[PDB]
Design an enzyme around this catalytic site. Structure first.
Site, PDB file in Angstrom:
ATOM      1  N   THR B  14      25.309  60.036 -47.189  1.00 21.26           N
ATOM      2  CA  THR B  14      24.312  59.320 -47.978  1.00 21.26           C
ATOM      3  C   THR B  14      24.741  59.201 -49.432  1.00 21.26           C
ATOM      4  OG1 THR B  14      23.072  61.370 -48.342  1.00 21.26           O
ATOM      5  CG2 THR B  14      22.453  60.017 -46.438  1.00 21.26           C
ATOM      6  N   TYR B  15      25.509  60.173 -49.924  1.00 17.28           N
ATOM      7  CA  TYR B  15      26.021  60.094 -51.288  1.00 17.28           C
ATOM      8  C   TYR B  15      26.991  58.929 -51.450  1.00 17.28           C
ATOM      9  CZ  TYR B  15      28.457  63.461 -48.344  1.00 17.28           C
ATOM     10  OH  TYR B  15      29.037  64.107 -47.276  1.00 17.28           O
ATOM     11  N   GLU B  81      32.892  67.078 -61.579  1.00 17.87           N
ATOM     12  CA  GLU B  81      33.536  68.383 -61.528  1.00 17.87           C
ATOM     13  C   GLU B  81      33.765  68.785 -60.076  1.00 17.87           C
ATOM     14  OE1 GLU B  81      30.919  71.425 -62.793  1.00 17.87           O
ATOM     15  OE2 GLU B  81      32.434  73.012 -62.870  1.00 17.87           O
ATOM     16  N   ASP B  86      31.030  74.434 -50.298  1.00 13.95           N
ATOM     17  CA  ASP B  86      29.577  74.399 -50.334  1.00 13.95           C
ATOM     18  C   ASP B  86      29.015  75.705 -49.778  1.00 13.95           C
ATOM     19  OD1 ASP B  86      28.735  73.973 -47.321  1.00 13.95           O
ATOM     20  OD2 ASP B  86      30.367  72.550 -47.683  1.00 13.95           O
ATOM     21  N   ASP B 127      16.213  67.605 -52.861  1.00 16.84           N
ATOM     22  CA  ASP B 127      17.100  67.737 -51.708  1.00 16.84           C
ATOM     23  C   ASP B 127      17.944  69.001 -51.851  1.00 16.84           C
ATOM     24  OD1 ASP B 127      17.801  66.895 -49.196  1.00 16.84           O
ATOM     25  OD2 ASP B 127      19.406  65.559 -49.866  1.00 16.84           O
ATOM     26  N   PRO B 130      21.747  74.019 -48.466  1.00 17.94           N
ATOM     27  CA  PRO B 130      23.057  74.664 -48.654  1.00 17.94           C
ATOM     28  C   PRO B 130      24.220  73.694 -48.772  1.00 17.94           C
ATOM     29  CG  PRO B 130      21.789  75.863 -47.032  1.00 17.94           C
ATOM     30  CD  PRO B 130      20.999  74.622 -47.348  1.00 17.94           C
ATOM     31  N   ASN B 132      24.227  71.015 -50.464  1.00 21.05           N
ATOM     32  CA  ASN B 132      24.224  70.503 -51.828  1.00 21.05           C
ATOM     33  C   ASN B 132      24.414  71.596 -52.873  1.00 21.05           C
ATOM     34  OD1 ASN B 132      23.873  67.857 -50.964  1.00 21.05           O
ATOM     35  ND2 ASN B 132      21.633  67.968 -51.068  1.00 21.05           N
TER      36      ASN B 132
END
Ligand SMILES: CC1(NC(=O)O[C@@H]2CC[C@H](c3cc(NC(=O)CCc4cccnc4)n[nH]3)C2)CC1
Lengths: 274, 298
Positions: B14-15, B81, B86, B127, B130, B132
């Site tokens: 989705t990003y 950055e 994640d 949102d 974990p 993100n």
């Protein structure tokens, strides 16, 4: 001073400081049209008034219009020598950027090209929106003139609950003060005063200096120069009367005041010159 | 848009299309989110314009920084950055041995600091999951992906419904509340907090009603006493089964007394009573990590 009550979610003075510190990042220039010698100050009023009417037809929020106004003014401060026929493209593209930022279901690109009566292509708007956002260094989150009025109206109708995030104030008087602000924003000389000063001065004309200072934190001397400048615009609204709250199809009544309206305010702007 | 050499694709979702790039001269590595503008009929996506403007004013050590926005060849490059992993991948790698408790406390403390910075700037993340939450090799964790973020006004108005990934969605969202604000992010962090402790998701539902019932089965079916106005919410049904609240000694066994207290306040049903990010930083659970500052009584 700070008129916000104790905030459970953050330090009350910290939230207010950030809002004030942002107003120094976003610069205004009441004489940016000197960089465009061929343009006249009235052309800006005709453009912004057209954007008001476009917002009401598509039922766009007042915040969306004032985002487009702020995007237009700050972009022209970065550019030089602009013609009249280029104004409609810059204005409708500023509204396109603003609508995509603020609305949940914004209008499509072709609808923004549709209202231009065929004078702006869908790809012309896409080229203009990139130039606007790049020239503004992607700083597209200002505290609009109408956003300050929302803050001032919430603190005015605060109880001992101190819940500052749940809206609670009369929609009737909100659209009356916004009506005064919609007229003043057509005049370019308003940029001399900060956006927070302009909203507090319009609320003062519909109330008092005590309520103004209680909800804005600004002393009387901070807004006296703005109140004196807002003098002709305030009486023009008083001579014609205060408008009524409109209902919009598909818009819930608990949000009807947030919808941008439009009258024939171009005639009222000329009476405030004397 | 030169001097950057793509090294590895991070993912597409989705990003957008995220690549890992490396500066050839300086050796610096960044993350490149690529946006093909020729395939976007509506120009720059609304989620792209929001994230860029928000991140250009949210500079914080616990927020993944936006470094530059380069536009070239009908492409929009967002330079971020870079962090090497994640949280979800880290929790999965730590599922057998568990994450050490000092590291869970350090991570939650940093997450609350970045969230308190977002809320003081009047920005909801909406949102927090974990996937993100990004970590580096220096013990830091940072909030990422602000495409679903939104700046809220004072006061707020009705915002986008059905936000937040389902497993981390607050109960007021599931019940169809008109207005919402900072409380929805705290609920997500409470779920992430317990997930770091138990090494499994707290409420792993597969639908809106199943997610709500999994919350009810653990925290008890709320009523007007624990949550005033819950019986009047649009998605509330009087047919909801009555489950008893479970003892947190069984929900989060490894958590001590101060940990269960903080988790309870982050999972309060009432959004008005749910602990804030700033107040959570002052909880006695972090009394060994941070020391209080002198407060001016003026
Ligand atoms: C992508 C996503 N969504 C998002 O919006 O992240 C923004 C955009 C890119 C920026 C970013 C991402 C990042 N590290 C990772 O993703 C870890 C995965 C990985 C895989 C292979 C090689 N290396 C790393 N460092 N910097 C911030 C986080 C979910």
């Amino acid at each position: 001073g700070s008129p916000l009550p104790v905030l459970s979610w953050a330090n009350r003075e910290e939230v207010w400081k950030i809002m004030l510190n942002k107003e120094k990042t976003y610069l205004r220039d009441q004489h940016f049209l000197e960089q465009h010698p061929l343009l006249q100050p009235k052309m800006r009023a005709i453009l912004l008034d057209w954007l008001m009417e476009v917002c009401e037809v598509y039922k766009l929020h007042r915040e969306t219009f004032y985002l487009a106004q702020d995007f237009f003014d700050r972009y022209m401060a970065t550019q030089e020598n602009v013609v009249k026929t280029l104004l409609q493209l810059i204005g409708i593209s500023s509204l396109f950027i603003a609508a995509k930022l603020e609305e949940i279901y914004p209008p499509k690109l072709h609808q923004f090209a549709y209202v231009t009566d065929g004078a702006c292509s869908g790809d012309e708007i896409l080229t203009m929106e990139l130039m606007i956002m790049k020239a503004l260094k992607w700083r597209l989150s200002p505290l609009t003139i109408v956003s300050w009025l929302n803050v001032y109206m919430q603190v005015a109708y605060l109880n001992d609950l101190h819940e500052v995030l749940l809206p609670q104030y009369p929609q009737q008087i909100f659209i009356q003060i916004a009506e005064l602000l919609d007229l003043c924003v057509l005049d370019v000389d308003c940029l001399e005063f900060p956006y927070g000063i302009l909203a507090a001065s319009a609320l003062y004309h519909f109330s008092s200096s005590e309520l103004m200072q209680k909800v804005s934190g600004y002393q009387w001397c901070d807004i006296e120069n703005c109140v004196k400048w807002m003098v002709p615009f305030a009486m023009v609204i008083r001579e014609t009367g205060s408008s009524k709250l409109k209902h919009f199809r598909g818009v819930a009544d608990e949000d009807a005041h947030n919808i941008q309206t439009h009258r024939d305010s171009l005639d009222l702007l000329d009476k405030a010159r004397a | 848009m030169e001097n950057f050499q793509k090294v590895e694709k991070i993912g597409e979702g989705t990003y957008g299309v995220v690549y890992k790039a490396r500066n050839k001269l300086t050796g610096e590595v960044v993350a490149l989110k690529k946006i093909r503008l020729d395939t976007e009929t509506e120009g720059v996506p609304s989620t792209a314009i929001r994230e860029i403007s928000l991140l250009k004013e949210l500079n914080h050590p616990n927020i993944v920084k936006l470094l530059d926005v380069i536009h070239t060849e009908n492409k929009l490059y967002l330079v971020f950055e870079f962090l090497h992993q994640d949280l979800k991948k880290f929790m999965d790698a730590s599922a057998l041995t568990g994450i050490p408790l000092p590291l869970i406390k350090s991570y939650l403390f940093q997450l609350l600091q970045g969230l308190a910075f977002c809320h003081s700037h009047r920005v909801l993340h909406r949102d927090l999951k974990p996937q993100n939450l990004l970590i580096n090799t220096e013990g830091a964790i940072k909030l990422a992906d602000f495409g679903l973020a939104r700046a809220f006004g004072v006061p707020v108005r009705t915002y986008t419904h059905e936000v937040v990934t389902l497993w981390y969605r607050a109960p007021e969202i599931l019940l169809g509340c008109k207005y919402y604000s900072t409380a929805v992010d705290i609920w997500s962090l409470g779920c992430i907090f317990a997930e770091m402790v138990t090494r499994r998701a707290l409420f792993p539902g597969d639908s809106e009603i199943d997610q709500l019932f999994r919350i009810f089965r653990t925290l008890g079916t709320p009523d007007e006493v624990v949550w005033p106005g819950v019986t009047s919410m649009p998605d509330y049904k009087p047919s909801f089964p009555k489950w008893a609240r479970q003892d947190f000694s069984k929900v989060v066994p490894p958590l001590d007394e101060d940990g269960r207290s903080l988790l309870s306040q982050m999972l309060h049903y009432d959004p008005n009573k749910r602990i804030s990010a700033k107040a959570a930083l002052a909880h006695p659970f972090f009394q060994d990590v941070t020391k209080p500052v002198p407060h001016l009584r003026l």
